[PDB]
Amino acid sequence: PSMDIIPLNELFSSQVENVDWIEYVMSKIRAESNLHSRDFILLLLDFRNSWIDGIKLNVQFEDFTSNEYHVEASHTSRIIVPIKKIDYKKYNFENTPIPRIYPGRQFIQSGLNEEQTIEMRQKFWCREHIISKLKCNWKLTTDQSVTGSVDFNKFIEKFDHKMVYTIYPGRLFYGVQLLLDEPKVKVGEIINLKIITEPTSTCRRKQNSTVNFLDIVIFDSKTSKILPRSNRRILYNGSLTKPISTTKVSEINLEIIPIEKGRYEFSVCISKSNNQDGIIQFDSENVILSVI
Amino acid sequence: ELSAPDTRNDYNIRGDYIATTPALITFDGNESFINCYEITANNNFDSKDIFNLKVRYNTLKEQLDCFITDAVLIEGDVEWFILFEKWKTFWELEILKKLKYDYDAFKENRIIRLLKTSIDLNKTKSKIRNLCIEKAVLDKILICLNKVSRGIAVCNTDMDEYVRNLVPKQLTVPVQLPGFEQFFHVQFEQMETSHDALHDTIATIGNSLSYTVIVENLSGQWGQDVIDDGGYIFEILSSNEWLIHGQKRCAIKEKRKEFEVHLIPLKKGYLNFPRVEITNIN
Amino acid sequence: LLNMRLRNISLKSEHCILSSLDFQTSKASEQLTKKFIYPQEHNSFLKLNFQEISYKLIDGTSQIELDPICPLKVPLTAFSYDSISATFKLVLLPKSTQPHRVKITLAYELELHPNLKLPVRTSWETSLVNSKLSNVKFKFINSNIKVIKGEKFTMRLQIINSSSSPLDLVVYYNNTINPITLENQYQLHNKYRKIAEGIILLSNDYKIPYFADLRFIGIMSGYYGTLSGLKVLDLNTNELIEVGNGASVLI
């Protein structure tokens, strides 16, 4: 009787690799050596028992396995499954499925009809993707062999707006990777940084400013980003604002002339304009480099 | 471009900025455009010469109206054969009072007049009459630069044909001081509360004065404050300066002010006055 | 009037009180004897500190400063040793003695002996989270102690009630980015993103009915000071009060 979805950022380590989901994501990422994280989001189910004995609670999503999740009498327990998030460059998701009573009533939509009619379509189609694989099998604790399932279509409520862009990239605007030369540069050396941006199908709401202003912000990999005047820390050519199109895969550059450092971090944001409160999204792509 | 001076220095500069991926790297008088230059020193120490910058700037106010001139009202080479030619200086007495929208040219809205005087200006056809591909077809192009303002119409495509290349070239001082020495303080932290995970800012200095001083500040802590008393122990090498600290307290107004108003001072052994401090809390 | 001395005391509330005296060279006295020293062809002074001691002023007591000290002698300098006091509860201003022994010097003889002692009071003087309604005090039974390694761990919110309806309330973590000078927008966004996404709280709406265990897992690194998000909520309208307490490095 609740639901929450949380992304993932830490690669993790081998000595803690004994709980099921981290060894699942690590084992899945031993091959396919382009992804590391930020693509293996993690959804938080919370099973609650309204009965009078323990149950054992497996869950299998796709090839995910579980432990012997011993639940108790009236005890809520939280069960953690990892999913690769729904890519909109493997699909399109602009289809309403008609129900099973073809009564031909042919009703209205009655909102901003290009926005909510496909927005709630995005909601219950991502709910269709979550429902259509998630499988549980439960047996009562040493007093039966009652091995049944537990259906979910009376349980998963809707998706709120956090639980759309957490599950579905393509709710927010630009897909961004960050292509770098080396992570292990010495001090006196010059590095081209190369972000690569992908404008989306869901830029169709505006089209007005084809130009859209980004930023590049540099974090210390503790906290507390360096200022524009990055004195004795990092050096660069020109103002970092460096526009992109809402047309195609634009590229951009800087020249991170490093000086007297270690363990930096680079990430962007999207600002649409020059003014304050123009900023509309903050990406989370955080490529770190070290300086020796 | 920053380059060599007029001596036989041959300094191994490697930093530069040519606009190589754009040709139009804009600027709008509120942001930075920081340009950085690595001037690595040659076979000797770096001297005190005068270097020279080379900036090939241009104002925006000639660039933006080329699509308002060579595209909007000079399309056909017969419609711009004689219509422009006998009134080019009349066009340059017309477009010089354009007063374009350089107050909202940050976000969008390039190539718009900002409504200085739009309606009274069309009386110029009366007292002087010329070819109607200019005298009657450019008032529509004056409306086409009044409305129809494109946010970014790829303005580097129609730039290089008419943009003049101004070139300021200022000096560059390499301004500095002259006293080279060194230091190396060593330290070992004494427990206060718990280790807070200390992080380093830096270690370098440059100074020359009369009754000269060299002040230093400690590292940066990112746990709970009033932190561990750093106990320090000197190796004040290669000189004889004057110490002023012993076993400070690392999140406070204490400062290991190793002053130097004294002798044993070599001169000009590097790019400036330098004394590589390099404190070590290990 | 040869070496100006000052004592600075800082009140570390989670430990003892720390007070450090500080010697200096007193420049308005150094140029005095510098004039006669360069009259006798000497560049700087050679005062020798041979017996420096802080004693706890009482009927009779003495202490020992919190690191090591040799018998030193410096020309134009400053030194500062630190000694730990005892953090008083309320209203007892302790006093100290702070004796010293500067030995001056001349041409291998004529060591004019000096001594000084400035006795004064060592009181400069500039984690329970109360409920702020009915003294339902919360304290973690191991606060600020956790070196986890992205493993599970358990804590202990020892709630202390009025023992008058002691079964009332529910904890929760609120994994949601709060909705908030442009880099003042970005620092608040990075703080609110790393708060609401780094740890999970495996017992979410635990509904406590007076210990708790509260197992977390913690999926990103970094020092999480003050551990925000971990709210409780109680029988009245909105007792949405924080814990504001406890911290964990996760590496």
mmCIF file of C-alpha atoms in Angstrom, chain A residues 4 6-10 12-13 15-16 21 42 44 46 77-78 80 162 215 217 219 222-225 267-269 275-277 279 282-284, chain C residues 149-152 174-177 180-183 185-187 189-190 193-194 196-197 200-205 217-222 250-251:
data_model
loop_
_atom_site.group_PDB
_atom_site.id
_atom_site.type_symbol
_atom_site.label_atom_id
_atom_site.label_comp_id
_atom_site.label_asym_id
_atom_site.label_seq_id
_atom_site.Cartn_x
_atom_site.Cartn_y
_atom_site.Cartn_z
ATOM 1 C CA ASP A 4 8.430 4.868 -4.637
ATOM 2 C CA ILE A 6 14.740 5.985 -6.767
ATOM 3 C CA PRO A 7 17.683 6.276 -9.238
ATOM 4 C CA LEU A 8 21.172 4.892 -8.750
ATOM 5 C CA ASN A 9 24.599 6.512 -8.836
ATOM 6 C CA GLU A 10 27.291 4.454 -7.006
ATOM 7 C CA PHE A 12 29.648 -0.110 -5.431
ATOM 8 C CA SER A 13 32.332 -2.576 -4.223
ATOM 9 C CA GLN A 15 33.125 -6.871 -0.416
ATOM 10 C CA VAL A 16 29.534 -5.672 0.071
ATOM 11 C CA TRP A 21 20.074 -6.218 -6.137
ATOM 12 C CA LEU A 42 15.530 1.133 -8.399
ATOM 13 C CA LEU A 44 10.791 0.461 -3.772
ATOM 14 C CA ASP A 46 6.561 -2.188 0.403
ATOM 15 C CA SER A 77 8.764 -4.834 4.825
ATOM 16 C CA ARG A 78 10.415 -3.016 1.935
ATOM 17 C CA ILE A 80 14.042 -3.603 -3.520
ATOM 18 C CA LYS A 162 8.243 12.143 -9.821
ATOM 19 C CA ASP A 215 25.804 25.872 -18.422
ATOM 20 C CA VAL A 217 29.225 23.658 -13.529
ATOM 21 C CA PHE A 219 31.882 20.368 -8.485
ATOM 22 C CA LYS A 222 32.848 16.760 -1.900
ATOM 23 C CA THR A 223 30.334 19.654 -2.138
ATOM 24 C CA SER A 224 30.336 23.368 -2.924
ATOM 25 C CA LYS A 225 30.982 24.169 -6.610
ATOM 26 C CA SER A 267 27.837 18.358 -14.921
ATOM 27 C CA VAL A 268 25.458 20.593 -16.834
ATOM 28 C CA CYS A 269 22.112 22.334 -16.559
ATOM 29 C CA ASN A 275 17.445 35.442 -17.092
ATOM 30 C CA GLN A 276 17.058 33.986 -13.624
ATOM 31 C CA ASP A 277 14.267 31.404 -13.213
ATOM 32 C CA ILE A 279 16.383 27.112 -15.644
ATOM 33 C CA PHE A 282 19.273 19.758 -14.089
ATOM 34 C CA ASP A 283 20.898 16.714 -15.591
ATOM 35 C CA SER A 284 22.679 14.113 -13.524
ATOM 36 C CA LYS C 149 30.405 1.136 3.379
ATOM 37 C CA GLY C 150 27.138 1.145 1.364
ATOM 38 C CA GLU C 151 25.973 -1.792 3.534
ATOM 39 C CA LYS C 152 22.943 -1.998 5.744
ATOM 40 C CA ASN C 174 10.449 11.680 2.235
ATOM 41 C CA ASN C 175 12.476 10.646 -0.794
ATOM 42 C CA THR C 176 11.339 13.640 -2.858
ATOM 43 C CA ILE C 177 13.425 16.583 -4.047
ATOM 44 C CA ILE C 180 13.408 25.216 -3.553
ATOM 45 C CA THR C 181 22.091 33.835 -7.360
ATOM 46 C CA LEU C 182 21.807 31.182 -10.034
ATOM 47 C CA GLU C 183 24.569 29.169 -8.422
ATOM 48 C CA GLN C 185 19.946 27.804 -7.130
ATOM 49 C CA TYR C 186 22.381 25.100 -8.115
ATOM 50 C CA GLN C 187 23.936 24.505 -4.678
ATOM 51 C CA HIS C 189 19.546 21.763 -5.958
ATOM 52 C CA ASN C 190 22.601 19.587 -5.365
ATOM 53 C CA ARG C 193 19.152 16.005 -4.604
ATOM 54 C CA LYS C 194 21.812 14.312 -2.525
ATOM 55 C CA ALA C 196 16.530 12.871 -1.063
ATOM 56 C CA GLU C 197 18.198 10.157 -3.061
ATOM 57 C CA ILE C 200 16.547 4.783 1.666
ATOM 58 C CA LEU C 201 15.217 3.873 5.207
ATOM 59 C CA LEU C 202 14.135 0.233 4.778
ATOM 60 C CA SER C 203 11.436 0.562 7.465
ATOM 61 C CA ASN C 204 9.508 3.440 5.978
ATOM 62 C CA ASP C 205 6.266 4.252 7.810
ATOM 63 C CA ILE C 217 21.086 1.076 3.239
ATOM 64 C CA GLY C 218 22.620 4.279 1.896
ATOM 65 C CA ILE C 219 23.338 4.160 -1.814
ATOM 66 C CA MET C 220 25.597 7.213 -2.259
ATOM 67 C CA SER C 221 28.793 8.390 -0.630
ATOM 68 C CA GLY C 222 29.750 11.643 1.038
ATOM 69 C CA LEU C 250 29.535 6.407 3.847
ATOM 70 C CA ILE C 251 33.088 5.582 2.802
#
